[PDB]
Amino acid sequence: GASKLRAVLEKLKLSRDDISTAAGMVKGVVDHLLLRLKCDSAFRGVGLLNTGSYYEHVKISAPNEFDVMFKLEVPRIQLEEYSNTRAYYFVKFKRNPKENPLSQFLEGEILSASKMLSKFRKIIKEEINDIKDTDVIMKRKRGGSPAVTLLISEKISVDITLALESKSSWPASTQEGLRIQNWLSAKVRKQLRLKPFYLVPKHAKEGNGFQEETWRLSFSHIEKEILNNHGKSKTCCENKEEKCCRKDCLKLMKYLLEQLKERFKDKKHLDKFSSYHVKTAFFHVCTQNPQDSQWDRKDLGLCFDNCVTYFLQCLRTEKLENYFIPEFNLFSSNLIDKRSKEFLTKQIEYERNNEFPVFDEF
């Protein structure tokens, strides 16, 4: 019916106009840090990957939560796959034309993420002390995950991820991924694979067996491009007659998971599940439902139910392929325990049967 769902979207947007003030505060700090990082020998070519102000909001429940990614271009990269995981690689250099300033970040022959991150945190920490025009402090240490957490005016938090940039062709593991031919045409897919790919140092809970010095592929820039150009029609959501509910279904699905995680934060068995699992499942639904008529504004309740049931199927069958790397199973028994998915399945099933009481009125 979406009468309830519409009411949900209306309160989430009222908080995003309040964000614009804090968004400018993020940009000011980010621009300042980039200025210093460029003055460093190793971080000479750093910069923002995508739109700096108002970057990713992993939490939509928390407007104060901010996510930022820094790109560092390194040419002539030799990627060695780690144990056929297909999502994690070792970074090596080729031929050594001459020693690079990045040689201070490598152990043995592989490029160490720990060394690069350590100096990265030190340079940032040095700067926020020299900033008294804007009250900022650094959080420590969040388990060791690459994200550096800063806090502006004691209310908003900003996570800064350092990523490597490669303008070479996408790895072989992404060959059969990004299947958007029926949805966004083979031309667009081909254009997207011409874009550079990115490497991100491993998570806090990696989890083993990981050598601790491997890097994970990142295509968040492609995901954003798809989100802003989601329609089968080139004018989708550019006029009143083509206002689909794709983005809304993604928000509701992300907000559902967050509300569930907040509800069971004492057990910490929904913490493995992140907004990226939801985001991954959503892209698959878009692939299975490429027509814009399958995402009509009037069928918001019906469209959201499809996203829910598909996510349920992914839990039961324990299959959730990475949208770019097919052989990478996000819901594999090695990444998340089976009891966790069954727990999440039961909770979601309860929400579907009782018209999602966790959403509203609140």
Among residues 123, 236, 312, 335, the one that binds Zn ion under rule CB under 5 A: 236
Tell me, by CB under 5 A, how many residues bind Zn ion.
4
Radius of gyration (C-alpha) of the chain in whole angstroms:
21
Please report whether residue 227 would count as binding Zn ion according to CB under 5 A: no
Nearer of residues 146 and 231 to Zn ion, judged by Cβ: 231
**Amino acid in position 309:** T
Among residues 77, 147, 199, 244, the one that binds Zn ion under rule CB under 5 A: 244
Q: How far is the CB of 230 from Zn ion (least distance, A)?
A: 5
- With tokens 């490598």, the residue in question is 106
Contact 295, 236 (CB under 8 A): no
If DSSP states are collapsed to H, E and C, what string results for 104-161?
HHEECCEECHHHHHHHHHHHHHHHHHCCCCCCEEECCCHHHCCCEEEEECCCEEEEEE
Part of the chain binding Zn ion (CB under 5 A), chosen from 38-46, 145-153, 169-177, 223-231: 223-231
Q: Is 92 helix (H, G, I), strand (E, B) or coil?
A: strand
Nearer of residues 77 and 244 to Zn ion, judged by Cβ: 244
**Amino acid in position 160:** I
184/163 Cα distance (integer angstroms): 27
Please report whether residue 286 would count as binding Zn ion according to CB under 5 A: no
Nearer of residues 162 and 244 to Zn ion, judged by Cβ: 244
Nearer of residues 168 and 291 to Zn ion, judged by Cβ: 291
- 267 marked as binding residue: no
Q: How far is the CB of 247 from Zn ion (least distance, A)?
A: 7
- 54 marked as binding residue: no
Contact 351, 345 (CB under 8 A): no
Helix %, strand %, coil % of the chain (to 5): 45, 15, 40
Part of the chain binding Zn ion (CB under 5 A), chosen from 128-136, 196-204, 225-233, 298-306: 225-233
- 20 marked as binding residue: no
Q: Which residue ranges make up the site for Zn ion (CB under 5 A)?
A: 231, 236-237, 244
- Binding site residue list: 51, 53, 65-67, 159, 202, 216-223, 230, 236-237, 244, 254, 275-279
